[PDB]
Design a protein around this ligand. Structure first.
Ligand code: CHL
Ligand code: CHL
Ligand code: CLA
Ligand code: CLA
Ligand code: CLA
Ligand code: CLA
Ligand code: CLA
Ligand code: CLA
Ligand SMILES: CC(/C=C/C=C(C)/C=C/[C@@]12O[C@]1(C)C[C@@H](O)CC2(C)C)=C\C=C\C=C(C)\C=C\C=C(C)\C=C\[C@@]12O[C@]1(C)C[C@@H](O)CC2(C)C
Ligand SMILES: CC(=C/C=C\C=C(C)\C=C\C=C(C)\C=C\[C@@]12O[C@]1(C)C[C@@H](O)CC2(C)C)/C=C/C=C(C)/C=C/[C@@]12O[C@]1(C)C[C@@H](O)CC2(C)C
Lengths: 152, 11, 203, 197, 42
C-alpha cells in the first residue's frame, strides 16, 4: 500500500511465523503430562500467542517483505494511533511532571534555607501542588501570555 | 515437583 | 492521676493525662504523641467502636436465632453470595452515595467543629451537640440522655467505649473462627461447652 | 455568598462581587485578575452557546416522540441532505462568525470602542458593562438585575452538564437521550449504567 | 512520631516508595493489557 508494503492480514510470512512459534511451543508441551501445571502454563502461552497475532492482524498494521510489522510516523490519517496519538499523550503526562516540579521550587523559594526543603521533601505542600498539573496547558499558556514564564 | 512450579502460576 | 492502668506498678505515658473517656494509659508504641494524632485516633476509635458493635449484634443475633427454629436466616459468611433483587454493584453504588454524604458531613465537622450544625434545606432545624463525635440533636439524641453532668457523661462514654472494644474483639474472633474451623460460631460455642477439655483450638 | 463545601475557606481573590460566586476554585486558575476577566467572559459566552445547543438537541426529540413532527436525531442531521452543500454553508458561517467574533474581541480588549455602527453613524449602543451589551440586543428592555445574571449563569452551568451527559451517554450507548430516559423509567433497578454495560 | 514522619519524608525513602508504586502500576497495566504496539481506542 504505502512504500510497497503488504497489509498484515493478507501476508503469508506472518502466518508462517505464527505456525513456527506455535510448533516450537507444542514441541515442549508434549514432554510433560497433559494435566500437569507446566501443560497449563504452555497452553496459556499458546493462547496468548494466538490472541496477540489476531489482535495485530485486526488492528490494521502493515507487514514488510520479510514478515514483520512496520510503523508509519509519516502523518497519514490511517495511522493516527501508530505514532501521533500516543505521542501527544506522552507530552501531556511529561508536561505534568515538569510543571509540578517547577511549581514546587517556587513554593520553597520564599524561605531563607530552601536546601532543607530540597533534600527533605514535605508531603502537605507537595500534595497540594501535585493536582494543579491536571490543567497545565491552560496555566502555562496564560503565564506565557502574561510574561511570567521567563526571568528578567 | 509440579506443585512447586504451580505455586508461581496460582493467579 | 491515680486511676487504674493496664500494667499495675508501671508509669503511664505523659500524653495520656486521664481526662479522655475510657483511658487506661495503654500506648507503649507512642502512636499518639502529637495532639492532632490524638484527636484523629479518638475519632477513629469511636467510629470503629460503633461500627463493630453494630456488626457484632447483627452477626450474633440471627445466627443464635437460627440455632433455634424461630428463623431461617442463612449464615453470615455466605450472605454476599446469595442472590437478591438486583446485582451487587448497583447496591454498592447506592450505598456508596448515601454513606458518602454522611461521611462528608462528619469529616467537615471534624475539620471545623461548628460549621455543619444547621439543616441546609430547612434552616429551622439544628443540632445541639457541642462535641466532636457526639452530634446530639433530635435526630441522634431523641431521648435527651446525652446531655447531663460531666461525671455521668464520662461514665456513659466509658461504657460505650468498653462495649465497642469488646465488640471489635468478638467480630474478629468470629471471622477467624469461621475461616479456621468452618462452622457457625454458636456451633463452636456449644461444642466447646459440651467438652471444655478437648474442644479447643488445638483440637 | 454561599460555600461550595462547608468547612472550607474561600480564596481571597474571589470576593463575591461577581455574579454567581460560590468560591469554587480548588486548582487556582483565577489568581491573576486578567485571567479572572478572561475566564469570566469565557464562562459567559461558553454556556450561552451551550443552553441553545442543549435545547436544540433535546426538544425536537421529545416533539418527534409525541408525534407532531418527524425530524432526524441530532447525530443524523449532518448525514441528511439539504438545499445547499455543507461546504458553502460552512464558508458562510465562517465569514459571518469571523466578523462578529472579531467585533466582540475588539470590544473585550478595549471596552466602549466598537459601539458605533460602521455603516449608519447616527445609531450607537448605550454604555454598559462588558459581556452584557444591552441596547438593541435587548428589544423587550428587561431589567438587567443581579438576580437575572445569577439565574442565567446557573442555567448555563446546567446546560454544560446536560451537553456533556448527552454526548458521553450517546457515545457509550447509541440510543438517543430521551429514549435512554424512557428506558430507565421502564425499570430503574435493571436499566441504570451499572446494570447495562 | 514527628521525627518518624520527618525521616520517612527524606529523599531516598520517598523516592523508593514512589518508584515502587509506579512500577506496580505499570506491571498491573501490562498484565491487564498483555501487549500492544499501537493505540486502538480511537
Ligand atoms: C463492611 C465490611 C465488610 C466485610 C468485613 C465483609 C466481609 C466479607 N465479605 Mg462482604 N464484607 C463487607 C461489606 C460488603 N460485602 C458485600 C458483598 C459481598 C459479596 C458479593 C461477597 C462478599 C464476600 C465477603 C467475605 C469474603 C471476601 C474476601 O475477603 O475475599 C468476607 C467475610 C464474599 C462472600 O461472602 O461469598 C463467598 C462475596 O463474594 N461480600 C457488600 C455489597 C457490595 C458490602 C458493602 O459494604
Ligand atoms: C458545533 C460543534 C459541532 C460538533 C460537536 C459536531 C459533531 C459532529 N458532526 Mg457536525 N458538528 C458540529 C458542527 C457542524 N457540523 C457540520 C456538518 C457536519 C457534516 C457534513 C457531518 C457532521 C458529522 C458530525 C459527527 C462527526 C463525528 C466524527 O468525526 O466521527 C459529529 C457528531 C457527520 C455526521 O453526519 O455523522 C457522523 C457528517 O458527515 N457534521 C457543520 C457544517 C459545516 C457544522 C457547523 O458548525
Ligand atoms: C524539576 C523539573 C525539571 C525541569 C522542569 C527541568 C527543565 C529542563 N531541563 Mg533539567 N534536570 C532536572 C530537572 C528538571 N529540569 C534534573 C533533576 C536533572 C539532573 C538529572 C536535570 C538535568 C538536565 C540536563 C543535563 C539538561 C536539562 C535540560 C532541561 C531543559 C530542556 C528539557 C529537557 O531536556 O529535559 C532534560 C531532562 C532530564 C535529563 C531528566 C529530568 C527528569 C527529572 C528526574 C524529573 C523532575 C522530577 C523531580 C524530582 C520532581 C520533584 C517535585 C516534587 C517534589 C513535587 C529544561 C529547561 C537540558 C537543557 O539544558 O536544555 C536547555 C539539558 O541539557 N536538565
Ligand atoms: C450493621 C450493619 C448490618 C448490615 C450491613 C447487615 C447486612 C445484611 N442484613 Mg442484617 N441485621 C443487622 C445489621 C446489619 N445487617 C441488625 C442490627 C439486625 C437485627 C438483629 C439484622 C438482622 C437481619 C435480618 C432479620 C435479615 C438481615 C439481612 C441482611 C442482608 C440483606 C438484607 C438487607 O440488608 O436489607 C445483608 C447481608 C437479611 C438476611 O440475612 O438474608 C436475606 C434478613 O432477612 N439482617
Ligand atoms: C467551560 C468553561 C468554564 C469556564 C471558563 C469557567 C470559568 C469560571 N468559573 Mg465556572 N463552571 C463551569 C464552566 C466554566 N467556568 C461549569 C461546567 C460549572 C458547573 C460544574 C461551573 C461552576 C462554577 C462555580 C461553582 C464557580 C465557577 C467559577 C468560575 C471562575 C473561576 C474559576 C476558573 O478559573 O475557571 C477556569 C476554568 C477553566 C479554564 C476550564 C478548564 C476545563 C478543563 C480543560 C476540563 C475540565 C474537565 C471536564 C470534566 C472534562 C471562572 C470565571 C467560580 C466563581 O467565582 O465564579 C464567579 C465558582 O465559584 N464556576
Ligand atoms: C433563560 C436564561 C437566560 C437568562 C435568564 C438571561 C438573562 C439575561 N440576559 Mg442573557 N442570553 C441567553 C440566556 C439567558 N439570559 C442566551 C441563550 C443568549 C444568546 C442568544 C443570551 C444573550 C444575551 C444578550 C446579548 C444580552 C443578554 C442580557 C441579559 C439580561 C436581560 C435579559 C433578561 O432579563 O433575560 C430574562 C430571560 C428570560 C425570562 C428567559 C425566557 C425564556 C426564553 C423565552 C426561552 C426561549 C427558548 C425556547 C424553548 C425556544 C439578563 C441578565 C442583556 C443585557 O444584559 O443587557 C444589559 C443583553 O445584552 N443576554
Ligand atoms: C445533569 C444531570 C444528568 C442527568 C439527569 C442524567 C441522567 C441520566 N443518565 Mg447521564 N450523565 C451526565 C449527566 C446527567 N445524566 C454526566 C455529566 C455524565 C458524564 C459522566 C453522564 C453519563 C452517563 C452514562 C455513562 C450513562 C448515563 C445514563 C443516564 C440515565 C441513568 C442514570 C444513571 O444511571 O447514572 C447517570 C449519572 C452519572 C453516570 C454521573 C452523575 C452525573 C451528574 C454528576 C449528576 C448530577 C439517566 C436518565 C445511563 C443510561 O444509559 O441510562 C439508561 C448511562 O449508561 N449518563
Ligand atoms: C501498586 C499498586 C498496585 C495496584 C494498583 C494493583 C492492582 C491490582 N492488583 Mg496487584 N499487586 C501489587 C501492586 C498493585 N496491584 C503488588 C506489589 C503485589 C505483590 C503482593 C500484587 C499482587 C496481586 C495479587 C496476588 C492480586 C492482585 C490483584 C490486583 C487487583 C485487585 C483488585 C488490581 C488489578 C488481584 C487480581 O486481580 O488477581 C487476578 C490478585 O489476586 N495483585
Ligand atoms: C458549549 C458546549 C456545547 C455546545 C453545543 C452546541 C452548540 C451544539 C449544537 C448542535 O446540537 C445542535 C444544536 C444540533 C445538532 O444537529 C448539531 C450540534 C452542533 C451538535 C458545551 C460546553 C461544555 C463545557 C464543560 C462540560 C465544562 C466543564 C468544566 C468544568 C467541570 C470545570 C471545572 C473546574 O474549572 C473549575 C470550574 C474550577 C477549577 O478550580 C477546577 C476545575 C475542575 C478545573
Ligand atoms: C469496625 C470493625 C472492627 C473489627 C475489629 C477490630 C480490631 C480487631 C482492632 C484491633 C486493634 C488493635 C489490636 C490495636 C492495638 C494497638 O493500637 C493499640 C490499641 C494501642 C497501641 O499502643 C498498640 C497496638 C497493638 C498497636 C468491624 C466491623 C464489622 C462489621 C461492620 C460487620 C458487618 C457484617 O457482619 C454484618 C453486620 C452482617 C454480615 O452479613 C456482613 C458483615 C459485613 C460481615
Amino acid at each position: 500500500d504505502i512504500s510497497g508494503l503488504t497489509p498484515c492480514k493478507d501476508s503469508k510470512q506472518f502466518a508462517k511465523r505464527e505456525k513456527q512459534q506455535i510448533k516450537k511451543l507444542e514441541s515442549s508441551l508434549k514432554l510433560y503430562a497433559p494435566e500437569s501445571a507446566p501443560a497449563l502454563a504452555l497452553n496459556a502461552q499458546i493462547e496468548k500467542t494466538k490472541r496477540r497475532f489476531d489482535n495485530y492482524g485486526k488492528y490494521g498494521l502493515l507487514c514488510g517483505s520479510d514478515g514483520l510489522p512496520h510503523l508509519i510516523v509519516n502523518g497519514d490519517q490511517r495511522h493516527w494511533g501508530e505514532f501521533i496519538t500516543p505521542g501527544i499523550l506522552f507530552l501531556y503526562i511529561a508536561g505534568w511532571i515538569g510543571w509540578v516540579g517547577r511549581s514546587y521550587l517556587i513554593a520553597i523559594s520564599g524561605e531563607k534555607k530552601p536546601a532543607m526543603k530540597e533534600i527533605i521533601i514535605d508531603v502537605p505542600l507537595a500534595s497540594r501542588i501535585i493536582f494543579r498539573g491536571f490543567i497545565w496547558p491552560v496555566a502555562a499558556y496564560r503565564e506565557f501570555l502574561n510574561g511570567d514564564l521567563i526571568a528578567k | 515437583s509440579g506443585a512447586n512450579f504451580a505455586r508461581a502460576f496460582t493467579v | 492521676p491515680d486511676r487504674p492502668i493496664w500494667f499495675p506498678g508501671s508509669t503511664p505515658p505523659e500524653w495520656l493525662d486521664g481526662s479522655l473517656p475510657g483511658d487506661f494509659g495503654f500506648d507503649p508504641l507512642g502512636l499518639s504523641s502529637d495532639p492532632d494524632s490524638l484527636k484523629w485516633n479518638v475519632q477513629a476509635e469511636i467510629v470503629h467502636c460503633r461500627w463493630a458493635m453494630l456488626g457484632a449484634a447483627g452477626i450474633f443475633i440471627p445466627e443464635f436465632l437460627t440455632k433455634i427454629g424461630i428463623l431461617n436466616t442463612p449464615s453470615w459468611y455466605t450472605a454476599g453470595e446469595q442472590e437478591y433483587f438486583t446485582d451487587k454493584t448497583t447496591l454498592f453504588v447506592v450505598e456508596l452515595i448515601l454513606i458518602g454524604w454522611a461521611e462528608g458531613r462528619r469529616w467537615a465537622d471534624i475539620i471545623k467543629p461548628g460549621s455543619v450544625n444547621t439543616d441546609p434545606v430547612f434552616p429551622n432545624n439544628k443540632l445541639t451537640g457541642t462535641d466532636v463525635g457526639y452530634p446530639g440533636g433530635l435526630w441522634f439524641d431523641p431521648l435527651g440522655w446525652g446531655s447531663g453532668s460531666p461525671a455521668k457523661l464520662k461514665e456513659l462514654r466509658t461504657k460505650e467505649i468498653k462495649n465497642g472494644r469488646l465488640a471489635m474483639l468478638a467480630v474478629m474472633g468470629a471471622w477467624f473462627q469461621h475461616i479456621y474451623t468452618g462452622t457457625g460460631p454458636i456451633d463452636n460455642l456449644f461444642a466447646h461447652l459440651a467438652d471444655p477439655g478437648h474442644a479447643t483450638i488445638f483440637a | 455568598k454561599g460555600e461550595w463545601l462547608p468547612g472550607l475557606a474561600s480564596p481571597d481573590y474571589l470576593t463575591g462581587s461577581l455574579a454567581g460566586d460560590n468560591g469554587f476554585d480548588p486548582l487556582g486558575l483565577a489568581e491573576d485578575p486578567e485571567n479572572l476577566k478572561w475566564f469570566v467572559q469565557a464562562e459567559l459566552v461558553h454556556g450561552r452557546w451551550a443552553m441553545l445547543g442543549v435545547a436544540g438537541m433535546l426538544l425536537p426529540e421529545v416533539f418527534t416522540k409525541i408525534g407532531i413532527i418527524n425530524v432526524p436525531e441530532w447525530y443524523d442531521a449532518g448525514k441528511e441532505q439539504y438545499f445547499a452543500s455543507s461546504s458553502t454553508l460552512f464558508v458562510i458561517e465562517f465569514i459571518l462568525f469571523h466578523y462578529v467574533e472579531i467585533r466582540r474581541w475588539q470590544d473585550i480588549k478595549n471596552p466602549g470602542s466598537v459601539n458605533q455602527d460602521p455603516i449608519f453613524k447616527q445609531y450607537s449602543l448605550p454604555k454598559g458593562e462588558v459581556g452584557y451589551p444591552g441596547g438593541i440586543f435587548n428589544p423587550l428592555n428587561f431589567a438587567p438585575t443581579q438576580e437575572a445574571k445569577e439565574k442565567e449563569l446557573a442555567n448555563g452551568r446546567l446546560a454544560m452538564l446536560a451537553f456533556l451527559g448527552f454526548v458521553v451517554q450517546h457515545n457509550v450507548t447509541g440510543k438517543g437521550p430521551f429514549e435512554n430516559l424512557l428506558q430507565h423509567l421502564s425499570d430503574p433497578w435493571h436499566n441504570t449504567i451499572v446494570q447495562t454495560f | 512520631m514527628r521525627d518518624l514522619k520527618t525521616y520517612l519524608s527524606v529523599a531516598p525513602v520517598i523516592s523508593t516508595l514512589w518508584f515502587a508504586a509506579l512500577a506496580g502500576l505499570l506491571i498491573e497495566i501490562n498484565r491487564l493489557f498483555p501487549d500492544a504496539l499501537i493505540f486502538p481506542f480511537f
